Design a protein around this ligand. Structure first.
Ligand SMILES: CC/C(=C(\c1ccc(O)cc1)c1ccc(OCCN(C)C)cc1)c1ccccc1
Ligand SMILES: CC/C(=C(\c1ccc(O)cc1)c1ccc(OCCN(C)C)cc1)c1ccccc1
Lengths: 233, 234
């Protein structure tokens, strides 16, 4: 129902803050997973607030909202990381007080590290804009779990998600058209942006693989935990 | 290769299409699932290599970069093919014309039922979208070129990446042309382009789940090595 410009402003308004990591005591590479886990768990609370502010998301059932977040949360964390690392070549800006390069990633993730750095590089080359970024993040939330939900309710939920996804596509095209791009450039850029999302899913899968391999009780946010965070009064 | 028309690009991809293979099993014999699928895939991979070489722009790359792209994309390519020929068979996966299974038949293998349902959902989405053959071959070409392009600073590799992105742009223009030829409005054009490309994210996910299982098997030959792929390409 909203216009493209109304859509962008809504997404920009809903943006989560950049959080910080740790005492200015000596640094050690052993505590790296500790720092990143603490940060992530903290961001995830804010991500829930952001999601409820993505247009169309709260129109879904509580169950489907959880399913979408369950599928997308690490992808969302990762595109956020890649975004704030964009203007810091060769480094990943996990937090403003936690900026690491390749060699420091070797602490058992250097594979994922290199993949994130390459995505940052790609964003840099494409001159990715903030307005485009918030659209892509919204798309990840809506798309990542939409294929893994019969009932009439489900069919209506799926149709709604696809209609919102169509709206974000229109918004992306409008941003490019505002920027002065030709129709050919618009289509080509849209495609370039969406193809990156495949790589972000890949990195998320690799990351989730490690998280499950840790064999710890809450390393992956449970359905029940996500439900409680979403199901607010 | 970067000078073809949209129609020339399409006819090139359609002519390059690999054949549908059959499962190897005695049909007179009683009703091994992983054994059947592994044999099918291995035979399919040989034809996939011939196909890759006829994708415009691919052979312009170094043999090293060709192997890397195929390394990243081969199971994705097998899966989108599986989804495509399963499209007109709701609730079933058509692994081969003599091997059509439903939901409960994937339970024979650990974790397969998860993948099974994800594949069925993709075929359903394809059917809903009324995906066209010409669109399909474009999507499969995109998978080949895009999946490995993010995994360099050497002048040559900068040239290689540049080339891959120019080819991907050409396929994008081709997709748009197909849709414009079918009378879609500009809005419906870019909306459909987005819908199709977003499905490729789910296909990556399914490949990753599948790769996790193949690796979980402690077999030396199950995952095709760089050398094996280089032998086949070169
Ligand atoms: C790439 C960094 C990422 C972490 C991360 C990414 C982005 C960001 O903004 C913050 C952190 C990461 C690490 C741990 C983690 O699991 C903790 C989750 N809770 C839910 C138990 C999540 C992300 C990571 C994921 C898997 C393995 C190693 C590292
Ligand atoms: C989803 C079916 C797929 C098989 C398949 C995919 C596409 C196709 O057209 C036909 C069958 C499959 C299974 C194993 C496999 O690896 C074999 C090892 N070779 C590659 C050395 C490839 C495909 C599969 C992948 C992982 C585990 C179980 C099944």
């Amino acid at each position: 129902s909203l216009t493209a410009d109304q859509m962008v402003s809504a997404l920009l308004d809903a943006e989560p803050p950049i959080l910080y990591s740790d005492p200015t005591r000596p640094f050690s590479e052993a505590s790296m997973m500790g720092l990143l886990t603490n940060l992530a768990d903290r961001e995830l609370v804010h991500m829930i607030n952001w999601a409820k502010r993505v247009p169309g998301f709260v129109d879904l059932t509580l169950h489907d909202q959880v399913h979408l977040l369950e599928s997308a949360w690490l992808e969302i964390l990762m595109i956020g990381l890649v975004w704030r690392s964009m203007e810091h070549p060769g480094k990943l800006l996990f937090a403003p007080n936690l900026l690491l390069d390749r060699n420091q990633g070797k602490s058992e993730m250097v594979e994922i590290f290199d993949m994130l750095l390459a995505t940052s590089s790609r964003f840099r080359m494409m001159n990715l804009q903030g307005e485009e970024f918030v659209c892509l993040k919204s798309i990840i939330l809506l798309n990542s779990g939409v294929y893994t939900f019969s009932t009439l309710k489900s069919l209506e939920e799926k149709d709604h998600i696809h209609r919102v996804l169509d709206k974000i596509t229109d918004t992306l095209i409008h941003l490019m058209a505002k920027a002065g791009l030709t129709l050919q450039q618009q289509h080509q850029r849209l495609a370039q942006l969406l193809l990156i999302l495949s790589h972000i899913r890949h990195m998320s899968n690799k990351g989730m693989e490690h998280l499950y391999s840790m064999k710890s009780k809450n390393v992956v946010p449970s359905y029940d935990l996500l439900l409680e965070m979403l199901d607010a009064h």
